[PDB]
Amino acid sequence: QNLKSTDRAVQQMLDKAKREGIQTVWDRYEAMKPQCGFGETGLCCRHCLQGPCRINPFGDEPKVGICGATAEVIVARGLDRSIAAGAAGHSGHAKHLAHTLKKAVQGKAASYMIKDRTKLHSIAKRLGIPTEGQKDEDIALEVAKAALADFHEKDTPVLWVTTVLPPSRVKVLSAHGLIPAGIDHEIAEIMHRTSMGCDADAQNLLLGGLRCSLADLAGCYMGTDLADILFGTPAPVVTESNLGVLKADAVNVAVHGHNPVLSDIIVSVSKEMENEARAAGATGINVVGICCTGNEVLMRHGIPACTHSVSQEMAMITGALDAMILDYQCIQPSVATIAECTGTTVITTMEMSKITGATHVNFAEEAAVENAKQILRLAIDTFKRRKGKPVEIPNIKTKVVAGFSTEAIINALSKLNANDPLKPLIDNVVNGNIRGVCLFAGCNNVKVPQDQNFTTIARKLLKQNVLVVATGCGAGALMRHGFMDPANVDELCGDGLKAVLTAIGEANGLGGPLPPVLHMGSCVDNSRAVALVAALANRLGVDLDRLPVVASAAEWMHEKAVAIGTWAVTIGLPTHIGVLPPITGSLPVTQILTSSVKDITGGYFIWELDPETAADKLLAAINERRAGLGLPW
Amino acid sequence: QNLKSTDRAVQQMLDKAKREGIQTVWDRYEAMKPQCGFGETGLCCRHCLQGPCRINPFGDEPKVGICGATAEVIVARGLDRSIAAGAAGHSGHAKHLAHTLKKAVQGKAASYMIKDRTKLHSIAKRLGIPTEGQKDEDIALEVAKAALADFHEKDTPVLWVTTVLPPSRVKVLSAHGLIPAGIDHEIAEIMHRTSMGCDADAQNLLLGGLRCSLADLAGCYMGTDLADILFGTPAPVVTESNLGVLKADAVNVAVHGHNPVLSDIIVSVSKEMENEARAAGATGINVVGICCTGNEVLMRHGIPACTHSVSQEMAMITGALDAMILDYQCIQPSVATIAECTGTTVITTMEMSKITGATHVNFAEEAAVENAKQILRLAIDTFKRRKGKPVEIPNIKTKVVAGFSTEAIINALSKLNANDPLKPLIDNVVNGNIRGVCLFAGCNNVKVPQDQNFTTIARKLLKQNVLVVATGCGAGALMRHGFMDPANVDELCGDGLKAVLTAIGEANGLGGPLPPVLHMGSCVDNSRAVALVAALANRLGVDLDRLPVVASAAEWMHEKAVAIGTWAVTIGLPTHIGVLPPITGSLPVTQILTSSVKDITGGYFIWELDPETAADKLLAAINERRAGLGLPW
């Protein structure tokens, strides 16, 4: 079972699933072996009804697509569509939040409001929206309208690219024609250019994909911006993670998906309803998080994280999960079938994300509190039906200190230097206490024993004094293995890094260090790491491709994560990936993405299966950046 | 060779390609056999890096995707993305024309202008744009701005859906939530909902696809609208088709692709340059058409059609094609490799559609005449290099009467009834002279002997008095086999149909009938058949799913054609397809698309391999509609 997951709670539920005959993601993976080598290498195309076409990676025919498409065109077209799909997910999330903010300040959804007035005004300043003499509701309406305008062509490019990156970076991108004209405009243009008998030049195609990945960055950044306005900017919090946060005597309700627009309301209304749950025999309503919508309410409210990604079925296997409330993205559709065995009420809430066999509740922001009550009452009914039923909740959980928004990080640093908060961080980079910065991002993948790459790489970087920040299911992996617990700083961190975490924590009224890893939030909150790295770059007067900053999508899965990895390279970062993407069938495309993209953006993909080898390559990349600044290493 | 193409000129060039060792699309198809059965059935998914996943159509495992996706989810997701890709192609074409019209009336591209003032004003009326007291350039600017606004969400739905379909049809679509909110909005939403861990309900997924297909209809209709404003509404013309329109002593220049924005200019400037071509020893510049941009300038200017679709390489094999001028879509990238053997100068012109090994000329509307000259001079240089070289142009061509825009059809009918032009057509439907209407649309496909389905089905429908209209490469197939020559009416048409074609032609100052098939233009000009059928429906006071009107995408290939077939079903038409789409792996999805979609839109797909059987099923569908109106049959 430790070949499936390094998480001991997950291993325990795998034993239970095995003996109850419940099929899991790992079983479905095993039944799929051996996987198709054409798809694995990227040498398959189904973009027209003359296909499917394939190309032998080596040997005799087929050597070319029926229309004449070469291996390098087929590979670049397939990658481009996965970037566009990722952009469409992060774009759709941001768009829904834009409509919510607009409804809120137009008096149409009273359950929503401007919660962070500081954030609203700083965004409006960043966009060049006039604030002084304006009402908040009119500033916010201007911000929401500007958000919606970035989806289509207009007289400006996408402002959620051009106003978030260092001006030098924008000029480098603009010189290569890489600035997006509109978010949905770029998504559609990718789909057009990759359809049959259109773009057939690998380099032209990949430049389109880099541009589409910045459309995805815009959507990430807009989603983070709008969610902070509506629900508050995260600040440091303490909570717990892993399956042991479930409680047998409570109504256990998981929020699962990505968009917190309803899950933040569920959090609020669930407090309002403890009495109704006590009347059914529960201690209360135990809201817990799965995947990124769980990260959202962990970051803002300290909702304990139940589990993540590949292991999400295991929360049901406990027998104690009474409801699973879904919005969209990364939800294994298997949860709807598994619920018939485990008793869980699986509930979809979004018009464009339904699952056959789940109960659907048509959430509308105008009726959000009423919907949350209808939903939580289904959860209460479910808890009643398992009166007397035995549960197996693994008694396994970790302490999690989280909530490190970029504003929180700057604020924490300001306690060492009030008027120059970034300087203490840069000082310890220069003198070697901080070797560099590594962002862990992206999913788990069934192909990789769960969390194995994240923890192995992080363990080695931390001992080498790398400052480690994490998002999404990378934060999930680290948090479930103790990397967000300050009590483990002594074990995990080098002396230089420990010294810095201790000074910052001691200066923030804690008598203890910051945690070994800084949790910066959900996948769209990868935009927070951009805001931090960009601010560091602007303070040093250099572009991002000169900073000792790297990223590792160590176990990545989703098209969303492919987009993120690509815009990490596009904004200038050495970017490690721990699962082969479908590009090895084309050496020219692999060469572009792993080497020659350096000459365009200064970033590049680092393709490494072995996590120990990956850590060495990440340290080498961090150290080359150090040498380019003339730092010792 | 007749197993590859029923076109005798194509067969002759296949012999030449074979003996010169030049590989063709048919050779590349043969080298790809046997094709992958998982892809053929739709039972493959690569939407995340845990894949590729596949499902055995029958037998033991794998039975489900790794994430839990069922066969019906995987099949519906794959179809949805092909619809979105099609929508993005027709959308991009329309969008480029919208920007061109805006540049033209803003004084920025003097090579473009309002050429059809009648069309501009009728579109503006249809959209509710005020005309009286307004300048043309300000009406047109309003029309262009409204075109661009249909790509994103606004306070109205896509007007290029709601103002083009009968009001009853709009209410039926609106009741099922099928009206698009924005063209690129729907494309992105499809990409989101079909990414991993999102929509997992076949019916929900397919309803999204029907809505996205109407986004494609909007783009088709907008593209036709804008092209008519800019370049003129087609009116009946006489020309020729097939490889024999090439001339050994001329500079033979093919316009190839879909967007006529440059190819219409090439037509104009090529006249301006006969002397420069004569100075190099040519008789002149012989502009000919390939695929839909060729249809565009055939419809408006009588440019002879050289060839289409699957056979496009054959035009090069003659040795006489000096230049091939490409915009985008349906261009076999093989033309760039083949040119090294045949001497042809292959020229790309659009930023997002390049082909490795082709010469790229960066066309801009602001510099259109200068670009056309640079391009035509490359063609002249090429003609010089083949001085004395022998060519093999098959002496095979047909007479083509074309240009039947919906306005041209109404005008032609008006000569039988000035104030009620549709009535003569409806009269002969009622009394049986016209059994019904069949639209042939879409591509050729290497899987089907070229043109075999189109001609076989058309031959049987025409003898049964069906009025046949055609677009795209369906018009190409019919025109290259003599179906657009009035001299063949006696051979091809039933007595009822012949009587009507004769009366209309005789009443239009011809002493001869209309051609056996009415050529209504390019693939976006499928919107013209919609405008005609909608006008017929509005005149009878019924919805389109009550008219004896069918469609046949008899040899379809492109994702664009998948979108068209889907919106033909969505607007209510029985729609035959001649190549299996990747849906047979899911019986529930096949049942929805072939039967139960009837209960939503009244249209349905007719899946039939055998063209003789297809003609019977199309006649049966036409005759059931007749019976529903109480007509004899």
Ligand code: SF4
């Ligand atoms: S687009 Fe080309 S390579 Fe892809 S399926 Fe069609 S013929 Fe094959």
Ligand code: SF4
């Ligand atoms: S989305 Fe599901 S079915 Fe598709 S590749 Fe990923 S795991 Fe497999």
Ligand code: FES
């Ligand atoms: S041949 Fe297996 S992915 Fe297409």
Ligand code: FES
């Ligand atoms: S297994 Fe062949 S199309 Fe994927």
Ligand SMILES: [Fe+3]
């Ligand atoms: Fe996740």
Ligand SMILES: [Fe+3]
């Ligand atoms: Fe074509």
